[PDB]
Design a protein around this ligand. Structure first.
Ligand code: CLA
Ligand code: CLA
Ligand code: CLA
Ligand code: CLA
Ligand code: CLA
Ligand code: CLA
Ligand code: CLA
Ligand code: CLA
Ligand SMILES: CC1=C(/C=C/C(C)=C/C=C/C(C)=C/C=C/C=C(C)/C=C/C=C(C)/C=C/C2=C(C)CCCC2(C)C)C(C)(C)CCC1
Ligand SMILES: CC1=C(/C=C/C(C)=C/C=C/C(C)=C/C=C/C=C(C)/C=C/C=C(C)/C=C/C2=C(C)CCCC2(C)C)C(C)(C)CCC1
Ligand SMILES: CC1=C(/C=C/C(C)=C/C=C/C(C)=C/C=C/C=C(C)/C=C/C=C(C)/C=C/C2=C(C)CCCC2(C)C)C(C)(C)CCC1
Lengths: 340, 339, 329
């Protein structure tokens, strides 16, 4: 936390998650409980989407949110964009459900059996003890999360190359994509038309390039400690790293909301509905060209608008926490109105 | 119980059943009274169901639940899934009533004639007294229960192999199977596809295998105590062992609800109804494929959905007793919202 | 201790004369119901119709023995019912005579007598004289079993419902291994000759039990596994009579051999709604039932209520007077 003086600070219940921000074990426990909640939502809602799926209609009109996310990977897709056999969606939903179960079990284990601070441990638990002031352990955690995201990108790459086939909007069948792009100059040139790429080989080439970039960043962050040039320009607290991550996930949400509404192959038009139109009224939303009867919207509209609004409010959360990390009081803005 | 204040911690009447967690003389009376109520349900409710039975309609139509539980054992079913008499269901319910009567008598004995403690005797009861600190005696009680469960499994195998025939979904006849399964390779292969078996012989062979496995586990728990790493990893208390068993019975209830949902040979489709579909709305219910006239359900749904709910709430009871055994009092939650 | 007037018969626990008097008076009331209601519910009888439809309650038991019935199962007389009712009248007379003589004239404490009364006083802490009373009662019940055995040899034998004849039984079973295997074949033997053949074995068993109880007292373990108080001995007797009432309700439900089906009623059906009961296969419209359903249901409910009375006296005997007060703090 910030703690502009008053080192022994007490937070009330409406800021109740600020109480464990200094301790270590509850800091692990709350986050793995949150990951259990995300895995539970994923598995339980693709099961709920299998429960409320009709094969006599098109996909995106009935609010199909997760089954197009699995059909773009090409798991149970047939011919012409038709889904007749849904075994592996139920398989990955059950996998995510039991994964949420074991993650919640570990969360309650760290809340109950593991102590608050990991400095009282003796074996490997003392090596996992972290503080918001030393950047070395934070760099180790940073590099290992970099390595895990790179491993996830490599798993997606193997799903595109060896472990299965992806889906395209041209042939509307599965496709075993091999021999991707190997040139980084055209990847440097992809900063202008990244929204419409229209080729899956370029997609898996960009994915293996960003995956190898992530592995390089991971081994770089594990190998060298963080330097001194960034410690003079970046703040080192809980709310500072919270702010950097909040701005990162808000930018990622804006990027994903732009990617959802205009793409055609990473979001097929028969699975998510037609591509959208960026329409600014009061706020910039995404409207469909055709109008659904029961005031309804496609999955593309729901995904793009929800991710845009969540990215917007996460940007203001980054703003709140980043101004908090710079020393602002925030009753100073109430004292500025009260002095007036 | 965690013994917060001391061993004589107070309890109100909404938790008064925690008062005999350390007495170990009222434990016996409460448990065999629950066994008496279980046998009372098992007998009196099939006596209730034998009065409202219709021979023309299907058994999964009006809500017959216990009679399809006995019809798959081949007691009073004719050819093609039709019931020809009501006598063996009546005598099985009657002997369950007699077992309930003698177990309730033993319960009133153990709460009335037997003392509140069991270490206060001088005969065989001194060797029967248990408490929640020693691993070897509790392992002995566990091994005795494993021997009893394996004996029940071998009794089921003897019923299927020597005490008449059995119903199947292949020939639709009361069939006496023979030559059960020896190799565990198909038993290992059934671990990844346990929904459909397509063999009654492999079912009774797996039953003989798990029965012998339970006799072996009971003998192992009788002879040798826990080696020492269980005292380091696990816990040994009332609430901890209760939570272990609650998680076990919740997992058993989950897999039993799923086995009632998908399978169609252990539960015959002409007796319970058509095989259900796992429809997750606000909760996962195992819904029918046909529709009943006035808000009714088939008996397979009444089995599977109720056992799913009971497995869910027993999972949360396992969570409650696990947190109770791990030093959490649930009084820091009400104390973390003040000031 | 003191008992209120709403429940004050517990004073018979120490007074022995009233203990004899009230029970012999109760037996006089039973014999008065046996004699008087046979001679009073005879005007409801009509041999033109059936015996199961009118609701005759006593006379089925008299036609069970095979006194005034012949071929086809028809009643042509009343005079055997008259002589059995009349001996029940004079038996109730002499039994009530001894009853009120013990109530009014005999002393209460039998140990304060001089002749053959001081050797007749009983109490609740001895296994010897109570064993003598048990032996004499076992002798008399075995004598009643001997009378049932002699009914199949003296007056033409019992009545058979299968062959529709009052046949003389003269084939006793000389093997107790059939008696062992009867626990599956309860009320389904399809033979009337095997009932008397099972009655002579249990009759000689009753004589042997009475001889064992007269000759030797409880030799030591009955002082430990059992109690001798009045409430506990009442509990044991009520449990025995409740088991008897339940098995008699089962015999009135399922047998249709000892009870003739053309006289008592059709075979019954075991049902359960709120309480378990028995219902006829052929119902009657005027809110009436056969003697089978009436007897089986009433004996089932009375056996249940006397099982509850057995549990009440067992809780009263073993110190559980009022201990559920400590539920609420
Ligand atoms: C995703 C939801 C989530 C998760 C995982 C947690 C997790 C946690 N909360 Mg929490 N909390 C939440 C939502 C959540 N909270 C919400 C919505 C509120 C507002 C009602 C609170 C209010 C709150 C308070 C007031 C406190 C916690 C505390 C705790 C910690 C428990 C420590 C203990 O056993 O005592 C644990 C890390 C406690 C804590 O960290 O104290 C050390 C504590 O005092 N929480
Ligand atoms: C999303 C992933 C991620 C994150 C959060 C960071 C975060 C950071 N990197 Mg970094 N990095 C990454 C990926 C990432 N990197 C990748 C993929 C590479 C390519 C191999 C690098 C290569 C790199 C170098 C070469 C350096 C950093 C440095 C830094 C730190 C200073 C801030 C900075 O330079 O601007 C962001 C900061 C902690 C600098 C450092 O160590 O200073 C502390 C530094 O010199 N990074
Ligand atoms: C990375 C995510 C993240 C994390 C870890 C935190 C963490 C924290 N924030 Mg926070 N915040 C975030 C994102 C995040 N914030 C965003 C995106 C916003 C913008 C809206 C804010 C705005 C914000 C404010 C304004 C304040 C905090 C405060 C705090 C601190 C106290 C704990 C707390 O939140 O109270 C516990 C949380 C609650 C009691 C929840 C409040 C109940 C809300 C109103 C209901 C949820 C709204 C809605 C229904 C959500 C669903 C949306 C849609 C599906 C309908 C804690 C360190 C407080 C602080 O620094 O004081 C010490 C504080 O005053 N945050
Ligand atoms: C399955 C049902 C069941 C069974 C077998 C028992 C059995 C028992 N309960 Mg009990 N109880 C139950 C349900 C049950 N309870 C319910 C539902 C409640 C809540 C209303 C209680 C509330 C309760 C209290 C408050 C007490 C008992 C006590 C007892 C013990 C009796 C000792 C005595 O006579 O004094 C006995 C083991 C007593 C005990 O163990 O301590 C003497 C006691 O004080 N019970
Ligand atoms: C094998 C199962 C088992 C056993 C032996 C116990 C044993 C115990 N539990 Mg328990 N529990 C269980 C399962 C079990 N629980 C499950 C599955 C849950 C989740 C719901 C709980 C939740 C729970 C709580 C929240 C608490 C206990 C407590 C206790 C202890 C005190 C006795 C008691 O319950 O109060 C005496 C019993 C009663 C008062 C009976 C109440 C019955 C209510 C009125 C039923 C309401 C109807 C309900 C909807 C169910 C309907 C079923 C439907 C089919 C009709 C005792 C050691 C308490 C404790 O730790 O001590 C303080 C406590 O606070 N338990
Ligand atoms: C109408 C029938 C009748 C009659 C006339 C009598 C008459 C008598 N009984 Mg008697 N008795 C009867 C029925 C009858 N009892 C019945 C039905 C029972 C219950 C089985 C008893 C149980 C009984 C006992 C237990 C005793 C008598 C005793 C006596 C005698 C009183 C004292 C005496 O003379 O001996 C001096 C007296 C002759 C007492 C006696 O001494 O005679 C054995 C005695 O102790 N009676
Ligand atoms: C309904 C009639 C009846 C009644 C009330 C009793 C009652 C009794 N018998 Mg018994 N008995 C009976 C019929 C009966 N018997 C018959 C028909 C036989 C077969 C001959 C026996 C053979 C028998 C033996 C061999 C013994 C008893 C004993 C006993 C006493 C202890 C209870 C017991 O057996 O636990 C055990 C008890 C007073 C025991 C006794 O008096 O000594 C403890 C004993 O040893 N009985
Ligand atoms: C052979 C059978 C037998 C015997 C000898 C006894 C003997 C005794 N019982 Mg008893 N009891 C029995 C069977 C028996 N009971 C059965 C089967 C039940 C269950 C229904 C009970 C329930 C019972 C209770 C609940 C109590 C006794 C008590 C007593 C003792 C006090 C004296 C007495 O009877 O009060 C005489 C009492 C009355 C005559 C009742 C008053 C009048 C009522 C209101 C009328 C009867 C109600 C009934 C509905 C009428 C219609 C009859 C119906 C068949 C049509 C005495 C030792 C009491 C005790 O322990 O001592 C204080 C006591 O509290 N008994
Ligand atoms: C708040 C809080 C917290 C947190 C926690 C959490 C948040 C949790 C979560 C957790 C979770 C979230 C969990 C999960 C679980 C899971 C489960 C419970 C599952 C189950 C399921 C099932 C069993 C299923 C089944 C099936 C299958 C498998 C298939 C077929 C069909 C069916 C569907 C039936 C803490 C403690 C830290 C602190 C305090 C407060
Ligand atoms: C090709 C392609 C692709 C790929 C992509 C990629 C590969 C990307 C990358 C990306 C990246 C690679 C990005 C980056 C960016 C960055 C940023 C966004 C940053 C920001 C930040 C800032 C600006 C900060 C600053 C600072 C510092 C550094 C320190 C001092 C102070 C300050 C704070 C100021 C895809 C798949 C789509 C498809 C196909 C095509
Ligand atoms: C053949 C026949 C017959 C006959 C019958 C008889 C012969 C019967 C018998 C019966 C019997 C012969 C029975 C038995 C039973 C038994 C019981 C029922 C017992 C009980 C007991 C008790 C309850 C006791 C116990 C105890 C002891 C010992 C001690 C400890 C504790 C106690 C108390 C628990 C008739 C006529 C039908 C006809 C036809 C044929």
């Amino acid at each position: 936390m910030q703690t502009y003086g008053n080192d022994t600070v007490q937070y009330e219940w409406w800021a109740g998650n600020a109480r464990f921000a200094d301790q270590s074990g509850l800091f692990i426990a709350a986050h793995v409980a949150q990951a259990a909640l995300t895995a539970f939502w994923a598995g339980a809602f693709t099961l709920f989407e299998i429960s409320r799926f009709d094969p006599t209609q098109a996909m995106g009109d009935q609010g199909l949110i997760l089954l197009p996310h699995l059909a773009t990977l090409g798991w149970g897709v047939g011919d012409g964009g038709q889904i007749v056999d849904t075994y592996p969606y139920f398989v990955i939903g059950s996998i995510h459900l039991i994964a949420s179960a074991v993650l919640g079990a570990g969360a309650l284990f760290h809340t109950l059996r593991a102590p608050a601070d990991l400095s009282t441990l003796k074996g490997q638990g003392k090596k996992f003890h972290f503080t918001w002031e030393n950047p070395q352990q934070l760099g180790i955690i940073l590099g290992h999360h970099l390595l895990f995201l790179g491993a996830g990108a490599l798993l997606l790459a193997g799903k595109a190359m060896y472990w299965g086939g992806l889906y395209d909007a041209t042939t509307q069948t599965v496709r075993l994509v091999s021999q991707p792009t190997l040139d980084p100059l055209v990847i440097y040139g992809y900063q202008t038309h990244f929204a419409s790429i229209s080729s899956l080989e370029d997609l898996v080439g960009g994915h293996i390039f960003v995956g190898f970039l992530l592995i390089g960043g991971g081994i770089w962050h594990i190998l060298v400690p963080p330097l001194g040039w960034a410690k003079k320009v970046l703040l080192f607290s809980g709310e500072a790293i919270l702010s950097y991550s909040l701005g990162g996930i808000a930018l990622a949400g804006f990027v994903a909301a732009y990617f959802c509404a205009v793409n055609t192959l990473a979001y097929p038009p028969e699975f998510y509905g037609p591509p959208l139109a960026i329409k600014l009224g009061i706020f910039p939303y995404f409207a469909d060209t055709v109008e659904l009867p029961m005031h309804a919207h496609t999955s593309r509209a729901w995904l793009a608008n929800a991710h845009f609004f969540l990215a917007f409010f996460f940007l203001q959360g980054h703003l709140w926490h980043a101004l908090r990390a710079l020393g602002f009081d925030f009753k100073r803005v109430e004292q500025a109105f009260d002095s007036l």
